[PDB]
Symmetry: C4
Subunit: 162 residues, 4 copies
């Protein structure tokens, strides 16, 4: 199991089922899973920072990232690979030391280049097949939590200890 010094994640399709609610005025909702917050916990327990890369720019994600003590947030990302480089360079780590989870076309380049790639079970096939680990969960089912636990090797003794 590789050495991971950064954990990065997409939001829609990973922390959610891809759901995007719109009301008659064009306001938007998203639905996260409380199970995913434990992903942050295990990460921080092992001394690893967590970053979010998203193409959108919403208070929804800013707040949720704030709720969960996420270390790095990049919104309005036009090129997720560029986003991860920048952050890696700033952290002084290489892409090989990154575990990233994404679910769609704009996640492909970065997924083909990270140390560990995860893709939820809900995702398109040609993205799915880029996953270097088996994830059973679908987007919004707690797959970010599943991703982190597997990447970090969280066992029973890990659970007991906390």
């Amino acid at each position: 199991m590789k050495e991971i010094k950064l954990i990065l994640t997409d939001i829609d399709g990973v922390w959610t089922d891809g759901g995007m609610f719109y009301d008659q005025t064009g306001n938007e909702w998203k639905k996260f899973n409380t199970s995913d917050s434990a992903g942050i916990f295990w990460a921080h327990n092992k001394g690893i920072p967590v970053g979010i890369l998203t193409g959108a720019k919403t208070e929804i994600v800013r707040r949720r990232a704030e709720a969960l003590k996420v270390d790095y947030l990049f919104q309005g990302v036009v090129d997720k690979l560029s986003a991860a480089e920048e952050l890696c360079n700033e952290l002084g780590i290489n892409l090989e030391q990154v575990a990233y989870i994404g679910d769609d076309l704009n996640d492909a380049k970065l997924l083909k280049r990270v140390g560990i790639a995860g893709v939820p079970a809900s995702a398109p096939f040609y993205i799915r097949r880029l996953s270097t680990i088996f994830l059973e969960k679908r987007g919004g089912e707690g797959v970010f939590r599943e991703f982190v636990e597997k990447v970090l090797g969280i066992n029973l003794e890990d659970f007991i200890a906390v």
Copy 2:
């Protein structure tokens, strides 16, 4: 796949799971799936315009349509076949060259007329049986994206080409 020059689509039951959210104050919601934006991508990638027909008329659909850069939007449509037939005429295209995806009663006449008919796995049986291709996904699960990829025969080459 037969040759398609226009992809048409219903909303409720296709882009959503049929869900209609009502609150106490007169507001309404729909739940879309980001997954389906890639159906628009692929269509435009293959030079194919996308049109939306819906019986209802909500700002909910108008805004979503603009976000996804949909080419044609027709709301308040009571006769969807009549709507499809007029848009075909303006485009100078035939109905056999149209791919339509729908899920309910008011979609049935048009489904029987297009070149490729798609119906989500969640649709009532009397409509599902009209699909001329097999669709595994349910409404709101990315069935629109699945419809577009199949109808256009999007493959791994098309994927390697964009990344």
Copy 3:
């Protein structure tokens, strides 16, 4: 058997039991658009539909209006009495009523109607009261399913309304 009136519960039938609350006193319910056909099948035959619910919301008032439901009763704790009172006013007995419900406040009425329906999602003790098999769960079009079975809605009936 000959049905003259369709009655129905809301939460757990027209929805999956989901009750969305925010922080300000507002609420959601998520209905399914394919259920609106259930009303259509009923009205196409000249049969009214009524709603019996123990909650009282502007949500259901709005949805019932949009759907042109004939009878709406809210804040009902005694559904069996409320149904009989309507039946008396209609000149029918309960043996001519089809009722679909999902919980304890529905138990008495289900044991007494001509045809009782209970969604696949329902608690076992209520599910066993159903006199017809229903495959769908709350919020998945189980009301439409119920209406179609109760009214013997066949492929033949389907071709007719899409003429």
Copy 4:
């Protein structure tokens, strides 16, 4: 095992763990109407119900009020000590308590109560802490399932209440 108090977590038990955030980040939760019957069975058997939660929302307060929950502790930093604190005030032991929760911060309490439940949706490490089998996931009416098993609710009990 005789139970004098039932305690429950919210998110992941009364919900599928979904945390809805609106455009400005305000929260909604989806409850299931089926779970209220868990309150009803508790009170039928003369057992008070308590809610423990780390979050503090008006969402939970309104629902608790609506369901006539006996005890409500919010902003709880350690669920076990809050539970200890209430049991001390009521003069009961954790052994006389049944608790259902679903994540890490429930683990310590789950190991202390007389009957522990954990929903089928929960993380493996927490699920194994459950002392009775629960088939339902969070949001599916698993609080109700939990109470009916704990209290040994039989068809006899059901028949008794619908007379």
